[PDB]
Write a protein that binds this ligand. Structure first.
Ligand SMILES: [Zn+2]
Ligand SMILES: [Zn+2]
Ligand SMILES: [Zn+2]
Ligand SMILES: [Zn+2]
Ligand SMILES: [Zn+2]
Lengths: 618, 187, 586, 200
RNA sequence: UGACUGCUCCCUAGCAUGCUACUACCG
RNA sequence: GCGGUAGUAGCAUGCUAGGGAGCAG
């Protein structure tokens, strides 16, 4: 925290990797043997060999991923498009990227207009489209990092919010695992730079043995490996013209982060009925279970959401450090005390202060979160929990204690000030008391920065739990953004669920003999996904039926909506699926001389199949 | 399953069985043909049912080791490619200035963000618009980063050469305008 | 991990682990080689051993295939599979293999641990791939044999030209001279650093090092070997006499200081490789230089088996021919530097087999083929590809350091590819043009070994003398001491004062070192002395062993001097044919 | 994926061992494949055993399995003969008419265009086979005229005289004005801009 | 040039386990 | 007449592997 402030006085051309000349087989090299973090100060590497005869494999893999060699073999670059601090340029000419527009699906459009849709004055209309981008958009979108000031967070309340957050993250278990127990899905996706020039991640995951991966993991626990990171322009349907961007991390970072985090990361998405719901299926009657878990015991419930603006680009460094530190707190026995610090330094140098390669030339990334590693979806959740807790604390403190009626909350506030600005070490008794209070009056349900809160009303009305303005003030003074109160819903009733969570409106319906909650998406999104598609992916119906089955599955609850057209969407999808099937059979009958004899596929075009997915038995 | 040791025994057993069936001998002979053939099946109990699994296991092992050999060869190819890339791109270092400046450090440790700032022989400048071009790349030679650079080529987005005589106030809106100026270090 | 096999060129994935070189073996021929030797070890993508925990059975038929691993009877599951079945080892590509009727020769090459003369007998009587395989096995076994000696630690230094030297414990001391060049290293605190290259001799250990260094406490010396890579290209391409001289330009202007070489040259323009049967010093240092101006349009390649014997090729190139079109590569050994180093593409290239890069040319010239083997020529022809080749030398000289020869000595034509084609395929060339030595040795060698192809050269000045002596032999470690010859050195130099301006010949140079304490005359070794000699020389036999008493060790030793040398054939090998002048021993 | 040249019915078979790979339907493709040395036939995918590391090439040696095509030396016991019932397996296995008169096609397709009988066969066929014959004439002329070496001019003399050589081992080409020789020069890597000559 | 995690549908393959049916052997 | 054992077949469940696709942050 102190270093964050003290590092704003020093020139920006003195941070980053530290290089030194070493000799192999009589040949000079430049390698990174340390770093100079803005927060953690000088970190010196340990296992660097001043001399070496020949190098086998892992030394290649850690010498090629460094930015030192490429940077030293580059051309000095002065870029006047952005205020970001440039480093160098690898090739001779910068590369310009563009994003193609969408491809129409005229046949489905004609079938939709046949059934009397898209009339002037109707309620459901097209709003989501494949937006196409111009040329120099990648750099103009990377420029948005200019919204991340160096923020010095308050210390004496952070050192208590950390305790509360850690109390929240209690049930789960974590620890290091041997390199032969890791689990990876979709082993044929891209792997960073410059390893992408010779094959995807499967080739590196097969070329490397178990002892080699063990050595590479036990190596970074006592060293530092700065890396590079690529930037791409995504290709997906949206509702605002601003482009999206993803960042693929290098292979040597993921291949160690997996082994360091997998146990906890898999023990979180395997437990039902908690404050973090990553991994709870919204099918098979899971939405009702979640929404019943939320309404635990709150006395006079309301509902309260919020949404940070520029969540992944205004993240102050200190909060990300706290997130990583809390997520690496279960390592009580597996690793020593310096090992954890070196692992944290490696994480901070690989996914928080990397050398972004937006376009065709390197740059420095002042901060924020790179949404490509294996720990974003959980670090963001813990950051959200921290924000909520600190907002609540700030709300509870700043209230005239003369007018507090109860004799319990007043004493709690007294002891809160005592434990905040007077004590020096944690008091577990008071922390447990305050956490029980918080779960009694501020029950939360948290996904990766999208939240829903069922908070007491008669307390929040007199400022004992943060209503919304404490959230606004906390964001304003600790995130350098302004959460305008036009994107924050508030429901005064409970018989209808939260207004919007994960882009799914919630409806209370009567199925079977009782009432359950069903999520239904926005009809415009479904129609847009049906009408616009990348080429040959559908471009037509006959080849790829399995798109429409899943699309109809995701849009079944639309039948129960009291509005009319919202069920007509589902009926239109059903009829189109039937038409597609009975024309595919005709096509490969007429050109043939025979066709289908046994199908059993007649359950696709009738609701008996889709309805099964929203019943609680599986 | 066509040359097993019990196949000949089964063949002679069934030959005797059919010969005696054509003979129509005693009921004891009928039991003999119903039992010797029953044990002709009892030999094939394992003959035509165990090598059928043995061949499957052998094929599985053979394909698994085929895959292993392919992976092992790809490993060598990748190692060769990465080694040759390193030993080819290394020589761009221009070992004079770098070795001269490292010796000036306390124990040969300098921040990376300054090596291309002093020991790079080719500057590349990207300019968004004419008014910004006016300040930095003025004239045919300019100065930046405590040195003296000089212009040798000016291109635009479409990657075509444009001479400096055409960059005026009124001629600006007739160009693609991410101009890319490349310069060299003077002495 | 996958390649072509030695005998069939079929693609398989097996390696016999009991051979020092581990060659790729074809399934059928792998079985053929594995049945009848001690080779019970076969390697593949996995090593075929019972990898059960705590088991050490290490055969092929002893194992059974079970599951994803291999096991013997002690650990096999009931569902198993015999690896050794159908008379065929179970490996990759079990359906693309032809086998070979020739497996006994492979057995003999593999089984014979390079101990006798029959070794090289087999090593030449085999196939081209088989013979290069034999060559690399010979290199590997010599590198594993010569490194079986101690580390020559020097703890104190008295002065130069001798050291207070010791070795490791138990390991014997290697023999004396320049076939035993030390290139030892030294520690500082952790690992080995420079010392220099030497050759240790008896004094007190005399070092005949080509380099210099201030030696100190603890400096140790070894005979450092390297990694001998396998040989890809065959030793020589298959020749075919061209219908027309292509790639080479028949030029009209000629310098005819070399009358008996242009006739060879035109027919070389027709044939790939041609070796000239040249007696010792028949102007052999002039042929490629004559070609250089006869055909000044081809990239002529100069090379010799030694960095010191390349003297003849590298001398006159800058005396007769232009200077710009020549280049020679020198690694970092101290050799001739009048050419330019690190100049790959040049019209004239001079180098030794050790440090030449791969390039392409038209014409190649090679010297000193007697001491060459198929490995050496294979390296050169794997380095450079051309349109024609020329070899200079003769089988009838002292061969390579065949240290593995312990029983009866090797035969001349049995040396390598070129020596046996000089006698059975026919001499591509032959010479009598030796303007170097008089009528004595010309007729001597003509009748003796050089197939009577030489004519009476010049004046027999009658300065060579031969005696009738007995002598006695003594041994110390790996050298010989001959005192009834070492005092008779002077008692023999007696009868005119002009003998001593000569050079001292002996097989074991320990006798020369002891005689230097009497005379101080220069010491000469007979192994590597070709091309470097003085007009008059002294030849003391010092021995009667076949190490000196072969057919051809003294053959070139007699022609060392111009017209006068000592010719004491006190050995009973080839004394009793020649007719020289003699006196009684005084 | 077009109508075949003898039956005008949809098909997906291309004669692989043939010259120009014409379109044939299942019946007519069977007729073409059973009476010549056409042992390679192509489709949306080629017909070789796709079991790991196979070595087979002949159509009749394969057998259909799952989403993979195997061979008798590599097939699992669930086999299916691709060539059966007088009709090789392919798309549109029903709408085919075929014809026993395929000897003309069988000869002309396998015809090397070396004898006068070959051109007479070209003169004795149907119109579509005439188009195929002309295409094969041009294909074989192209494959013939690059059966010589590359005329490497190594040195230069006075005009109308050069030092011209060739590549390794290839024979002597025709010299008359039938062929318009055209070389391409190299800087270090790529071939560009010599121009068109005529050698005599 | 194509990121990380998380749920869902479909097709195939193997394994196991279970159930079931049909010829043989044993008491 | 029952029990048990080994062969070939059909059926269900689960676990795993592999491919293709759709939504969410
Ligand atoms: Zn740990
Ligand atoms: Zn062997
Ligand atoms: Zn065992
Ligand atoms: Zn047809
Ligand atoms: Zn096959």
């Amino acid at each position: 925290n102190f270093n964050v402030l003290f590092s704003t006085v020093f020139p920006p051309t003195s941070f980053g990797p530290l290089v030194r000349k070493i000799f192999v087989d009589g040949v000079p090299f430049v390698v990174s043997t340390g770093y100079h973090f803005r927060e953690l100060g000088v970190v010196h590497n340990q296992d660097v060999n001043l001399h070496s005869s020949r190098l086998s494999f892992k030394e290649l893999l850690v010498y090629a991923a460094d930015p030192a060699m490429h940077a030293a073999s580059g051309n000095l670059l002065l870029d006047k498009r952005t205020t970001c601090f440039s480093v160098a340029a690898l090739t001779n000419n910068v590369a310009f990227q563009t994003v193609k527009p969408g491809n129409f699906n005229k046949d489905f459009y004609d079938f939709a207009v046949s059934k009397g849709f898209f009339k002037e004055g109707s309620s459901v209309e097209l709003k989501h489209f494949f937006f196409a981008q111009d040329g120099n958009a990648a750099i103009s979108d990377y420029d948005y990092y200019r919204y991340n000031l160096p923020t010095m967070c308050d210390i004496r309340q952070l050192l208590f919010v950390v305790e509360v957050v850690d109390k929240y993250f209690d049930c789960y278990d974590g620890g290091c695992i041997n390199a032969n127990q890791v689990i990876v899905n979709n082993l044929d996706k891209s792997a960073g730079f410059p390893f992408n020039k010779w094959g995807k991640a499967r080739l590196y995951y097969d070329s490397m043995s178990y002892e080699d991966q063990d050595a590479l993991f036990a190596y970074t626990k006592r060293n530092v490996i700065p890396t590079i990171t690529q930037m791409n322009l995504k290709y997906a349907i949206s509702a605002k013209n601003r482009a999206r961007t993803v960042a693929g991390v290098s292979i040597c970072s993921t291949m160690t982060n997996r082994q360091f985090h997998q146990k906890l990361l898999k023990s979180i998405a395997a437990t039902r009925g908690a404050t973090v719901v990553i991994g709870t299926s919204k099918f098979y009657g899971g939405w009702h279970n979640m929404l019943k878990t939320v309404y635990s015991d709150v006395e006079n419930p309301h509902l309260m959401g919020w949404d940070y603006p520029k969540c992944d680009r205004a993240m102050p460094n200190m909060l990300r450090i706290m997130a990583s530190l809390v997520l690496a707190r279960k390592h009580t026995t597996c690793c020593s005390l310096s090992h954890r610090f070196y692992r944290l330094a490696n994480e901070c140098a690989q996914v928080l202060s990397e050398m972004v390669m937006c376009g065709g030339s390197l740059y420095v990334k002042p901060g924020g979160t790179s949404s490509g590693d294996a720990t974003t979806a959980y670090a963001n959740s813990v950051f959200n929990i921290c924000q909520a807790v600190t907002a609540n604390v700030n709300a509870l403190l700043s209230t005239d204690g003369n007018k507090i009626a109860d004799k319990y909350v007043r004493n709690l506030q007294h002891r809160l000030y005592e434990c905040l600005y007077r004590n020096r070490d944690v008091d577990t008794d008071f922390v447990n008391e305050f956490y029980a209070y918080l779960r009694k009056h501020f029950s939360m349900m948290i996904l990766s920065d999208d939240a829903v809160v069922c908070f007491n009303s008669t307390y929040a009305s007199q400022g004992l739990v943060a209503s919304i303005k404490n959230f606004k003030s906390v964001l304003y003074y600790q995130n350098n953004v302004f959460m305008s109160e036009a994107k924050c819903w508030t429901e005064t009733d409970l018989t209808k669920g939260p207004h919007e969570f994960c882009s799914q409106h919630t409806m209370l319906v009567k199925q079977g003999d009782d009432y359950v909650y069903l999520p239904y998406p926005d009809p415009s999104r479904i129609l847009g996904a049906g009408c616009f598609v990348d080429d040959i992916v559908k471009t037509d119906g006959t080849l790829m039926i399995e798109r429409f089955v899943s699309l109809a599955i995701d849009a079944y609850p639309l039948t129960k909506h009291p509005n009319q057209e919202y069920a007509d969407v589902f009926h239109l999808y059903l009829q189109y699926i039937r038409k597609l099937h009975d024309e595919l059979t005709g096509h490969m009958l007429d050109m043939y001389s025979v066709m289908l004899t046994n199908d059993n596929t007649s359950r696709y075009w009738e609701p008996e199949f889709y309805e099964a997915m929203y019943t609680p038995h599986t | 399953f066509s040359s097993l040791p019990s196949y000949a025994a089964f063949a002679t057993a069934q030959e005797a069985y059919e010969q005696a069936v054509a003979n129509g001998d005693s009921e004891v002979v009928l039991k003999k043909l119903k039992k010797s053939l029953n044990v002709a099946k009892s030999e094939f109990d394992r003959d035509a049912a165990m090598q059928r699994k043995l061949e499957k296991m052998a094929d599985q092992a053979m394909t698994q080791m085929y895959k292993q050999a392919r992976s092992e060869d790809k490993r060598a190819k990748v190692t060769s490619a990465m080694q040759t890339m390193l030993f080819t791109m290394l020589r761009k270092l221009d070992n004079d200035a770098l070795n001269n400046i490292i010796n000036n450090a306390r124990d040969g440790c300098v921040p990376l963000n300054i090596i291309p700032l002093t020991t790079a022989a080719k500057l590349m400048v990207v300019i968004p618009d004419y008014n910004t071009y006016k300040n930095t790349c003025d004239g045919t030679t300019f100065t930046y980063a405590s040195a003296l650079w000089e212009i040798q080529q000016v291109v635009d987005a479409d990657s075509k050469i444009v001479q400096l005589s055409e960059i005026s106030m009124d001629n600006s809106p007739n160009l693609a305008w991410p101009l890319i100026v490349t310069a060299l270090r003077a002495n | 991990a996958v390649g072509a096999c030695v005998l069939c060129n079929s693609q398989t994935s097996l390696r016999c682990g009991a051979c020092i070189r581990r060659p790729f073996l074809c399934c059928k021929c792998c079985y053929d080689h594995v049945i009848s030797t001690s080779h019970k070890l076969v390697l593949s993508v996995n090593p075929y051993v019972c990898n059960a925990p705590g088991c050490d059975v290490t055969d092929v038929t002893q194992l059974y295939l079970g599951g994803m691993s291999y096991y013997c009877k002690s650990h096999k599951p009931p569902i198993s599979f015999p690896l050794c079945a159908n008379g065929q080892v179970f490996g990759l590509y079990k359906n693309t293999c032809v086998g070979s009727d020739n497996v006994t020769d492979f057995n003999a090459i593999a089984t014979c641990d390079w101990t006798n003369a029959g070794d090289y007998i087999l090593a030449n009587t085999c196939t081209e791939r088989l013979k290069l395989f034999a060559a690399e096995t010979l290199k590997a076994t010599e590198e594993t044999f010569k490194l079986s000696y101690g580390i020559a630690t020097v703890r104190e230094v008295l002065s130069d030209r001798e050291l207070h030297l010791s070795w490791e414990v138990g390991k014997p001391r290697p023999p004396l001279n320049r076939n035993y060049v030390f290139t030892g290293y030294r520690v500082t605190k952790n690992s080995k650093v420079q010392i220099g290259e030497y050759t240790f001799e008896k004094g007190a250990v005399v070092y005949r090092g080509t380099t210099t260094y201030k030696l100190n406490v603890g400096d140790y010396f070894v005979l450092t070997s390297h990694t001998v890579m396998p040989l890809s290209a065959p030793t020589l391409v298959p020749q075919e006499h061209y219908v027309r001289i292509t790639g080479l330009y028949p030029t009209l202007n000629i310098s005819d200081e070399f009358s008996s070489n242009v006739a060879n040259y035109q027919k070389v323009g027709m044939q790939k490789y041609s070796t000239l049967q040249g007696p010792p010093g028949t102007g052999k240092s002039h042929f490629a230089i004559g070609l250089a101006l006869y055909y000044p349009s081809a990239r002529i390649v100069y090379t010799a088996c030694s960095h010191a014997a390349v003297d003849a090729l590298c001398e006159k190139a800058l005396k007769y021919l232009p200077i710009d079109k020549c280049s020679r590569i020198i690694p970092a050994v101290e050799c001739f530097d009048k050419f330019k180093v690190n100049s790959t593409l040049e019209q004239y290239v001079f180098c030794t087999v050790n440090a030449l890069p791969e390039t392409t040319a038209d014409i190649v010239v090679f010297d000193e083929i007697s001491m060459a083997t198929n490995y050496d020529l294979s390296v050169v022809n794997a380095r450079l590809r051309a349109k024609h080749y020329v070899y200079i030398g003769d089988p009838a000289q002292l061969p390579a350091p065949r240290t593995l020869l312990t029983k009866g000595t090797l035969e001349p034509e049995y040396f390598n590819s070129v020596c046996r084609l000089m006698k059975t395929i026919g001499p591509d060339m032959f010479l009598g043009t030796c303007r170097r030595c008089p009528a004595e040795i010309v007729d001597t060698v003509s009748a003796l070994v050089y197939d009577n192809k030489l004519k009476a050269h010049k004046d027999k000045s009658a300065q060579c003398f031969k005696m009738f002596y007995k002598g006695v032999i003594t041994h110390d470690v790996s050298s010989a001491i001959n005192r009834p010859q070492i005092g008779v050195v002077r008692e023999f130099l007696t009868r005119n004062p002009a003998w001593r301006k000569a050079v001292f010949i002996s097989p074991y140079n320990s006798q020369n070192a002891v005689a230097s304490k009497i005379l101080g005359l220069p010491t000469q070794t007979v192994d590597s002395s070709q091309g470097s000699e003085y007009d008059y020389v002294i030849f003391t036999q010092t021995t009667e062993t076949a190490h000196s008493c072969n057919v051809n060790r003294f053959n070139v030793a007699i022609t060392r001097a111009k017209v006068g040398i000592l010719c004491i054939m006190s050995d009973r090998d080839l004394y009793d044919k020649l007719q020289f002048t003699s006196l009684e021993i005084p």
